[PDB]
Amino acid sequence: PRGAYGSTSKDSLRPLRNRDEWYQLNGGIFLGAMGGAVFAYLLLENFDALDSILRGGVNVN
Amino acid sequence: TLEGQTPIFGGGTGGLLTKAEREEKYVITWTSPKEQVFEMPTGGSAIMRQGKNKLEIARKEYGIALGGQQLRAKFKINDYKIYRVYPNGETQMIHPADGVFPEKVNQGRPKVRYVDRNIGSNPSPAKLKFSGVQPYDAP
Amino acid sequence: SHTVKIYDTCIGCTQCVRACPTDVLEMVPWDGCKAAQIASSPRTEDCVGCKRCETACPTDFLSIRVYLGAETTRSMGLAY
Amino acid sequence: ATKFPKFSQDLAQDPTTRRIWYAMATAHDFELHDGMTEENLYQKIFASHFGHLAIIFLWASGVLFHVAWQGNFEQWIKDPLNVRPIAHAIWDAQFGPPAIEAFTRAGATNPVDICYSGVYHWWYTIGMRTNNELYVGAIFLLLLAALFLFAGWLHLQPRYRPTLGWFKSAEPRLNHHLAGLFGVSSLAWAAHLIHVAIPESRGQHVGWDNFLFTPPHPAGLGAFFTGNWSAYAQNPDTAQHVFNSSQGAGTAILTFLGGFHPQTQSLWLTDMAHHHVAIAVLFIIAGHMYRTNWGIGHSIKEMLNSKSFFGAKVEGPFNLPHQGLYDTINNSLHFQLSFALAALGVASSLTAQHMYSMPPYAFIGQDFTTQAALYTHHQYIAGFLMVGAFSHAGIFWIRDYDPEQNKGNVLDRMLRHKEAIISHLSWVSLFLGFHTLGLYVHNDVEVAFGAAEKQVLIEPVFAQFIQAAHGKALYGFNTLLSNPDSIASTAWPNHANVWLPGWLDAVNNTTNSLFLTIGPGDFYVHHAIALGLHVTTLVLVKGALDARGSKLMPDKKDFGYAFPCDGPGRGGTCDISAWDASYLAVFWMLNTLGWVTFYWHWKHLAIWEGNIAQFNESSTYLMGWFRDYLWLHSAQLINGYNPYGTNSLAIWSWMFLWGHLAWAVSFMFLITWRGYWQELIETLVWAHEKTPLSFGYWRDKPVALSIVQARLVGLTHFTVGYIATYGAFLIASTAGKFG
Amino acid sequence: SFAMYCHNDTMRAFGRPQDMFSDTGIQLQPIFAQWIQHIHTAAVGA
Amino acid sequence: DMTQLTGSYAASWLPWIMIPLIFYILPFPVFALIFIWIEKEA
Amino acid sequence: MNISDTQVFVALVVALLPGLLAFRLATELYK
Ligand code: F6C
Ligand code: CLA
Ligand code: CLA
Ligand code: CLA
Ligand code: CLA
Ligand code: CLA
Ligand code: CLA
Ligand SMILES: CC1=C(/C=C/C(C)=C/C=C/C(C)=C/C=C/C=C(C)/C=C/C=C(C)/C=C/C2=C(C)CCCC2(C)C)C(C)(C)CCC1
Ligand code: SF4
Ligand SMILES: [Ca+2]
């Protein structure tokens, strides 16, 4: 590879020197991004229930 | 390698653990005049064979207890030896260290950790502040 | 490891060596007592600190002293 | 080995869970750290003290901020006698609607806690009126804590690390801490009372915006420099003065009236200003006693080493050899810490004994729960400080005392008759215990058998005489201040008893706690307190004096302050170290302070009820304490929640049981000992190794807690349960029956 | 056994009796002991 | 109303988020930090 | 009349100064 990802490059800030590492990183990135987006979406979609939760309003009944 | 036949034992829960395979293990070997029943150091009874035996034990105190209080005191067996076995395979014989039992004085043994005074003359800790020397280690 | 020291009041009765459950002590030639022998502690790495040796010592005060120190696997008496 | 702990390779090489436990226990024992020098010891301590000071300032900032943010300080100003001060808001998401309603009170629209620390009364007396003033104080303390945090870092940089000689210079430190830290601070506080607090108590606002051009007295500073100091005492606050208003308000800034302000039932603000003025002068004078750099001044080393009394040959002060002591204190940080802890312990006891009897804050004497909380808080802290004074005294004997440099001096003499000291302390404890308990159970049997007239009821005549000598005419004695014709009351040469009319009014007032009437029930409990004081002293003194050694362990000094035992030999040596004596003494300190706070609380409960006769007739036998104090006053506490609902006492109910639970857990650590648990842990170690799907494995081998660690952990649960159980009962039994 | 008592104390203190382990909340009926009582009563004909 | 946790004080939404953060959100990451600190090899 | 939203936010920002200095002192004492 050209530049910082060549064999002789000593770039300590760019340590993923293998293609397989990059593909595994990409798979993790996609799955984690989808999971985090869905987690935020679920928290926001249930914001009324979660706001009652964090104020103790679910303990009326 | 350590030679000898393991005593007849059906298995127990007080045997070796991960420490035997990871850090160290101990082996006690002895010769008996006959087949007889002895007590395993960690519970249960085992049958020592007619010839020479070999028992694997988790701690050195097990060998001293078995050899000292059972083999010597009860079965009149005085030729037991304790080895320390490391995971790499290195084996060293540790008891009796020089072939003579420690309670019997043997020539050539040096004095180790001997203090040339009575215990009441140890210096006060205030004299040895910030020096790192304990009162019992003071000259 | 624990530290085991032997002082000059030892009378060479061999009782501390016999009482040791891990063979830390042995008896060595000496001339300071009638028995012509004194206790030694060459194997303090195997000392557990039970202080059985101090219990067996007949002199007053003790001719053998155990000072509990850094704890290791074998000093803690751990089979695991 | 592990990096943690950085200060001990012996612990860092420990392969068991004991390594983590002991790292936290010995982290602040700087002297035992690897490669620790004396100079590095003092420098690390000096920076540590900066951190502790910053923590105190942050703590005070948090108290101010939460009151200004969520409290009701401004509402409480308008009616201090009927408005409940608010500590902070409650945000517990597990609350139900009944709990939310129960804790929504004191005029708030959200759940809140009721402040019982007295900070509302304190800030009100010192002239704070608005939440913005509290907020500015909170912000100021944040910056002050930042200043001390930076100072600690600065004095660790290589150029600013003080030398060991700087730390050892005792005379300049005493001069600056007496004249400056005690004197100038007292003078500055008196300035705050004169310039701010007193004008604010008269309806006049004085702040940073107008204090430069608003004189505190009409005579100005001219009266001070011309010698006309009496102008400051003219026209004091009238007996009809209304606090925080100009109605009936005088102009004097330094009076010496004595007694209490008739409305607030607290000490006069102008009296407190003159108090800190006179205290400042005395301490500034005291700060010039020792020589630093100009020849004049005493040398403490010379005074201790002196052997001539105006020519006559003497052993020393009071004909007692004090030589060699200067180096003993100056080289022993534990000796210095022992005096500092003892002085703070006595000061904390004096705070508790004097704040309830002479309330210094407006209307704080009428906040019954606050009064009980403050007295119990400062007495228990005093007991802990007293234990620490003797604990570090025992540490001094082992670590810092050497017989050679103290040969023949007064410190060596004490060690040479320790048996006489310990045996006589044992006799006093036995005499007090046998007769105090014996008289209780004698009264128990008589009252139980319907013969309450057959009780032994010794009158506390000696203490009653002291109260009469202070002006209490209730007992009918006619001595000293209770006798108007006595030379003490008249002060015949000068008649300068301008304090006496105010003092006598407060003394003979039946609505305050100034010299509460005492009878036979008070006689017995003080002898219970004397028993507790002497036994706790006996345990602590015996541990300190036997720290070097005893017949059972002649060489105890070579083993350190805290070791488990010396084995089962020689009969057995459990709890033989000096640390163990401090461990045992905490049990007696808790018991003694229990008797002290039980007595204070029950006596004040009877007075506040209007049922003083209950205490007078029931405190003479132990069943009266158990029935009319414990059982009787627990009723409303244990009904904070029940099958019918919850009220505001539900927290004190839950914490009451929480303290009992922590107390019970301590018994496990204290009764069961290590070898039982080590064998059990070994069995669990086997189970884990043989169970599939349990991929976890210990990096540190699980071991039972050490012998010493068990005593400490058990003592901690015992103490925490002790404080939590009584604190919940103290708050609930007083706040449930009053404001 | 015991930590559910602590659960009950906290629920009752919170003013949440419906979350308690009780006959009126989360019920824990000893059905096997109740069954034995019914069997032993019906054995004699009662 | 007294059926929910509320606050009449300024920024009453602060306890709404700070109580979860300090008590059951951050403490486990904090324990993880300390655990890594006390287990690091020399 | 208790403090306002701005005052609470100002106190939070101001508290960062002792917060960072506490970290500096703690790490310095660790040396
Ligand atoms: C790590 C890993 C591990 C593992 C895996 O891997 C395990 C496993 C086992 C098995 C085998 C068994 C069964 C289980 C049960 O049931 O029980 C438990 C429970 C639980 C729950 C446990 C727990 C589990 C795990 C831990 C999980 C974790 C997760 C989390 C969430 C984390 C979190 C984190 C954050 C940061 C906080 C057991 C047991 C026992 N343990 Mg055992 N573990 C361990 C850990 C631990 C520690 C630390 C300690 C101390 C505390 C102990 C303790 C104990 C005791 C006492 C006992 C008993 O008894 C038991 C037995 O033996 O039988 C028989 N052990 N274990
Ligand atoms: C499942 C049980 C449970 C749990 C987990 C909580 C959790 C909580 N409650 Mg709570 N509560 C409960 C049951 C429970 N409650 C019940 C049954 C009641 C009665 C109905 C209450 C009544 C109640 C009130 C009235 C209040 C709380 C508060 C709180 C919060 C503060 C944390 C705490 O209590 O101390 C946890 C303690 C610590 C984390 C310790 C901090 C670390 C310091 C440095 C220790 C220092 C020790 C100290 C110096 C030595 C002692 C000093 C002492 C003598 C003064 C927290 C959200 C308070 C709140 O709203 O907080 C914002 C509050 O005001 N609760
Ligand atoms: C200003 C006061 C002061 C100072 C500077 C010291 C300083 C010291 N003491 Mg000391 N002490 C004091 C007051 C003080 N003490 C008091 C009042 C008592 C009586 C209770 C004691 C009783 C005492 C004993 C019995 C021992 C010491 C020891 C020590 C030294 C080592 C500290 C240690 O073990 O690591 C730090 C230790 C800890 C952090 C202990 C953990 C906390 C304990 C268990 C309390 C439980 C926490 C509780 C639940 C909540 C508290 C609030 C939380 C934030 C911690 C150190 C020089 C030890 C020593 O010198 O060994 C030879 C020792 O054995 N002290
Ligand atoms: C209710 C609990 C209780 C009681 C009554 C005692 C009693 C005593 N403790 Mg003690 N202690 C306790 C709990 C208790 N402790 C706990 C929990 C601890 C923590 C471990 C300690 C730690 C401790 C230490 C460290 C020390 C004491 C000391 C003392 C003695 C000093 C008081 C004294 O002489 O009074 C007089 C004696 C008594 C009141 C005891 C009762 C006497 C009985 C009632 C006489 C009855 C005679 C009768 C014929 C008996 C019937 C026959 C029967 C044998 C079958 C005394 C024997 C000190 C000591 O021994 O100094 C002399 C001491 O150094 N104790
Ligand atoms: C029903 C009445 C009653 C009872 C049952 C007791 C019971 C007891 N008293 Mg007691 N006492 C009482 C009334 C009573 N007292 C009265 C009215 C007084 C006068 C105020 C005293 C004054 C008193 C003192 C001064 C002492 C006791 C002691 C004792 C205990 C041992 C007494 C004994 O003979 O041991 C058997 C006797 C011996 C083993 C040796 C003799 C001990 C005596 C008391 C001292 C020698 C007498 C001599 C004149 C020196 C006096 C010293 C004194 C001036 C300080 C015992 C628990 C002693 C105690 O608690 O010890 C710890 C103790 O020293 N009592
Ligand atoms: C730890 C708890 C504790 C302690 C130690 C005390 C201790 C004391 N309380 Mg007390 N008290 C407590 C808790 C406690 N209390 C509680 C919880 C309450 C409930 C609120 C009370 C309520 C209370 C009241 C209401 C009174 C006391 C009083 C007293 C004192 C009695 C004085 C006396 O009779 O001596 C008698 C001594 C003499 C008559 C002296 C005789 C001559 C001697 C021998 C001197 C001889 C000349 C001398 C050598 C020369 C001087 C030399 C000098 C310069 C060195 C005493 C100091 C009384 C007191 O005086 O308070 C100030 C008092 O009226 N207490
Ligand atoms: C030491 C002082 C102190 C103490 C004990 C408390 C206590 C409390 N605060 Mg608080 N607070 C303080 C100062 C303090 N405050 C200051 C100075 C500010 C302004 C920045 C705030 C701002 C604040 C907000 C905005 C909120 C609280 C809340 C709370 C409660 C829940 C805990 C929480 O969420 O923390 C939150 C803490 C912060 C946002 C910052 C705290 C900053 C202080 C100075 C840190 C102190 C660190 C301490 C000294 C080091 C301990 C050392 C260790 C050995 C013990 C609790 C009653 C919550 C509440 O009211 O619930 C009902 C809440 O939402 N606090
Ligand atoms: C530097 C710093 C800082 C900052 C910080 C930050 C920037 C933070 C952030 C943070 C964040 C931003 C975080 C986040 C997180 C996240 C998470 C935690 C997530 C989770 C998720 C999940 C759990 C998911 C799940 C899932 C999946 C996976 C699939 C299916 C679905 C679900 C949803 C289930 C500050 C200034 C403060 C201070 C100073 C320092
Ligand atoms: S028991 Fe004591 S006297 Fe006997 S040999 Fe050992 S050290 Fe010497
Ligand atoms: Ca619900």
Side-chain angles (χ1 to χ4, degrees), chain D residues 373-384:
Chain D
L374 283 170
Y375 182 89
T376 305
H377 166 90
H378 281 109
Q379 282 287 52
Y380 268 97
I381 278 176
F384 274 106

PDB file of all heavy atoms in Angstrom, chain D residues 373-384:
ATOM      1  N   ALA D 373     -29.439  16.400  67.353  1.00  0.00           N
ATOM      2  CA  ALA D 373     -28.510  15.947  66.324  1.00  0.00           C
ATOM      3  C   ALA D 373     -27.122  16.538  66.530  1.00  0.00           C
ATOM      4  O   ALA D 373     -26.118  15.829  66.418  1.00  0.00           O
ATOM      5  CB  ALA D 373     -29.047  16.305  64.939  1.00  0.00           C
ATOM      6  N   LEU D 374     -27.046  17.835  66.835  1.00  0.00           N
ATOM      7  CA  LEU D 374     -25.749  18.491  66.970  1.00  0.00           C
ATOM      8  C   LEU D 374     -24.983  17.980  68.184  1.00  0.00           C
ATOM      9  O   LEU D 374     -23.762  17.800  68.120  1.00  0.00           O
ATOM     10  CB  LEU D 374     -25.935  20.004  67.050  1.00  0.00           C
ATOM     11  CG  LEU D 374     -26.220  20.703  65.721  1.00  0.00           C
ATOM     12  CD1 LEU D 374     -26.624  22.148  65.951  1.00  0.00           C
ATOM     13  CD2 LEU D 374     -25.011  20.621  64.806  1.00  0.00           C
ATOM     14  N   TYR D 375     -25.675  17.755  69.302  1.00  0.00           N
ATOM     15  CA  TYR D 375     -24.998  17.251  70.492  1.00  0.00           C
ATOM     16  C   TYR D 375     -24.480  15.837  70.268  1.00  0.00           C
ATOM     17  O   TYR D 375     -23.331  15.524  70.599  1.00  0.00           O
ATOM     18  CB  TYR D 375     -25.938  17.291  71.696  1.00  0.00           C
ATOM     19  CG  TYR D 375     -25.290  16.820  72.976  1.00  0.00           C
ATOM     20  CD1 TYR D 375     -24.615  17.706  73.799  1.00  0.00           C
ATOM     21  CD2 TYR D 375     -25.349  15.487  73.359  1.00  0.00           C
ATOM     22  CE1 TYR D 375     -24.017  17.282  74.965  1.00  0.00           C
ATOM     23  CE2 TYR D 375     -24.752  15.053  74.523  1.00  0.00           C
ATOM     24  CZ  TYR D 375     -24.090  15.955  75.323  1.00  0.00           C
ATOM     25  OH  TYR D 375     -23.496  15.528  76.486  1.00  0.00           O
ATOM     26  N   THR D 376     -25.323  14.966  69.713  1.00  0.00           N
ATOM     27  CA  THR D 376     -24.911  13.592  69.452  1.00  0.00           C
ATOM     28  C   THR D 376     -23.796  13.543  68.416  1.00  0.00           C
ATOM     29  O   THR D 376     -22.885  12.711  68.510  1.00  0.00           O
ATOM     30  CB  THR D 376     -26.116  12.771  68.994  1.00  0.00           C
ATOM     31  OG1 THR D 376     -27.166  12.886  69.963  1.00  0.00           O
ATOM     32  CG2 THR D 376     -25.747  11.309  68.838  1.00  0.00           C
ATOM     33  N   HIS D 377     -23.853  14.429  67.422  1.00  0.00           N
ATOM     34  CA  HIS D 377     -22.846  14.445  66.366  1.00  0.00           C
ATOM     35  C   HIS D 377     -21.466  14.771  66.921  1.00  0.00           C
ATOM     36  O   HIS D 377     -20.480  14.097  66.604  1.00  0.00           O
ATOM     37  CB  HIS D 377     -23.250  15.456  65.293  1.00  0.00           C
ATOM     38  CG  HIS D 377     -22.157  15.804  64.335  1.00  0.00           C
ATOM     39  ND1 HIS D 377     -21.944  15.105  63.167  1.00  0.00           N
ATOM     40  CD2 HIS D 377     -21.231  16.790  64.359  1.00  0.00           C
ATOM     41  CE1 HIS D 377     -20.927  15.641  62.517  1.00  0.00           C
ATOM     42  NE2 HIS D 377     -20.476  16.664  63.219  1.00  0.00           N
ATOM     43  N   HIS D 378     -21.377  15.802  67.762  1.00  0.00           N
ATOM     44  CA  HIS D 378     -20.081  16.253  68.247  1.00  0.00           C
ATOM     45  C   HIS D 378     -19.564  15.427  69.416  1.00  0.00           C
ATOM     46  O   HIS D 378     -18.351  15.398  69.642  1.00  0.00           O
ATOM     47  CB  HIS D 378     -20.153  17.733  68.633  1.00  0.00           C
ATOM     48  CG  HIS D 378     -20.075  18.661  67.460  1.00  0.00           C
ATOM     49  ND1 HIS D 378     -21.156  19.386  67.011  1.00  0.00           N
ATOM     50  CD2 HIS D 378     -19.047  18.968  66.635  1.00  0.00           C
ATOM     51  CE1 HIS D 378     -20.796  20.107  65.964  1.00  0.00           C
ATOM     52  NE2 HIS D 378     -19.521  19.871  65.714  1.00  0.00           N
ATOM     53  N   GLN D 379     -20.441  14.756  70.160  1.00  0.00           N
ATOM     54  CA  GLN D 379     -19.959  13.856  71.201  1.00  0.00           C
ATOM     55  C   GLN D 379     -19.387  12.573  70.609  1.00  0.00           C
ATOM     56  O   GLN D 379     -18.337  12.098  71.054  1.00  0.00           O
ATOM     57  CB  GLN D 379     -21.078  13.535  72.192  1.00  0.00           C
ATOM     58  CG  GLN D 379     -21.364  14.631  73.210  1.00  0.00           C
ATOM     59  CD  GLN D 379     -20.296  14.750  74.286  1.00  0.00           C
ATOM     60  OE1 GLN D 379     -19.106  14.852  73.995  1.00  0.00           O
ATOM     61  NE2 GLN D 379     -20.723  14.738  75.541  1.00  0.00           N
ATOM     62  N   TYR D 380     -20.058  12.003  69.606  1.00  0.00           N
ATOM     63  CA  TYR D 380     -19.550  10.787  68.979  1.00  0.00           C
ATOM     64  C   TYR D 380     -18.247  11.049  68.238  1.00  0.00           C
ATOM     65  O   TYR D 380     -17.334  10.217  68.266  1.00  0.00           O
ATOM     66  CB  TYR D 380     -20.598  10.199  68.036  1.00  0.00           C
ATOM     67  CG  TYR D 380     -21.491   9.173  68.691  1.00  0.00           C
ATOM     68  CD1 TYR D 380     -22.737   9.524  69.185  1.00  0.00           C
ATOM     69  CD2 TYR D 380     -21.084   7.854  68.822  1.00  0.00           C
ATOM     70  CE1 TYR D 380     -23.555   8.591  69.785  1.00  0.00           C
ATOM     71  CE2 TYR D 380     -21.896   6.914  69.421  1.00  0.00           C
ATOM     72  CZ  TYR D 380     -23.130   7.289  69.901  1.00  0.00           C
ATOM     73  OH  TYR D 380     -23.944   6.357  70.500  1.00  0.00           O
ATOM     74  N   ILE D 381     -18.145  12.196  67.565  1.00  0.00           N
ATOM     75  CA  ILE D 381     -16.890  12.568  66.920  1.00  0.00           C
ATOM     76  C   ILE D 381     -15.792  12.740  67.960  1.00  0.00           C
ATOM     77  O   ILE D 381     -14.647  12.322  67.752  1.00  0.00           O
ATOM     78  CB  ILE D 381     -17.081  13.839  66.073  1.00  0.00           C
ATOM     79  CG1 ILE D 381     -17.682  13.478  64.717  1.00  0.00           C
ATOM     80  CG2 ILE D 381     -15.769  14.586  65.899  1.00  0.00           C
ATOM     81  CD1 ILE D 381     -17.978  14.669  63.862  1.00  0.00           C
ATOM     82  N   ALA D 382     -16.127  13.347  69.099  1.00  0.00           N
ATOM     83  CA  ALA D 382     -15.154  13.502  70.173  1.00  0.00           C
ATOM     84  C   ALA D 382     -14.668  12.152  70.679  1.00  0.00           C
ATOM     85  O   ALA D 382     -13.479  11.980  70.969  1.00  0.00           O
ATOM     86  CB  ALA D 382     -15.763  14.313  71.313  1.00  0.00           C
ATOM     87  N   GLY D 383     -15.576  11.183  70.803  1.00  0.00           N
ATOM     88  CA  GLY D 383     -15.170   9.858  71.239  1.00  0.00           C
ATOM     89  C   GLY D 383     -14.242   9.178  70.252  1.00  0.00           C
ATOM     90  O   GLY D 383     -13.288   8.503  70.645  1.00  0.00           O
ATOM     91  N   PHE D 384     -14.514   9.337  68.955  1.00  0.00           N
ATOM     92  CA  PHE D 384     -13.625   8.782  67.940  1.00  0.00           C
ATOM     93  C   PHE D 384     -12.257   9.448  67.978  1.00  0.00           C
ATOM     94  O   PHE D 384     -11.229   8.774  67.854  1.00  0.00           O
ATOM     95  CB  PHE D 384     -14.252   8.929  66.557  1.00  0.00           C
ATOM     96  CG  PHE D 384     -15.176   7.812  66.196  1.00  0.00           C
ATOM     97  CD1 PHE D 384     -16.545   8.003  66.196  1.00  0.00           C
ATOM     98  CD2 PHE D 384     -14.675   6.567  65.864  1.00  0.00           C
ATOM     99  CE1 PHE D 384     -17.396   6.974  65.868  1.00  0.00           C
ATOM    100  CE2 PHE D 384     -15.523   5.535  65.536  1.00  0.00           C
ATOM    101  CZ  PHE D 384     -16.884   5.741  65.538  1.00  0.00           C
TER     102      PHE D 384
END
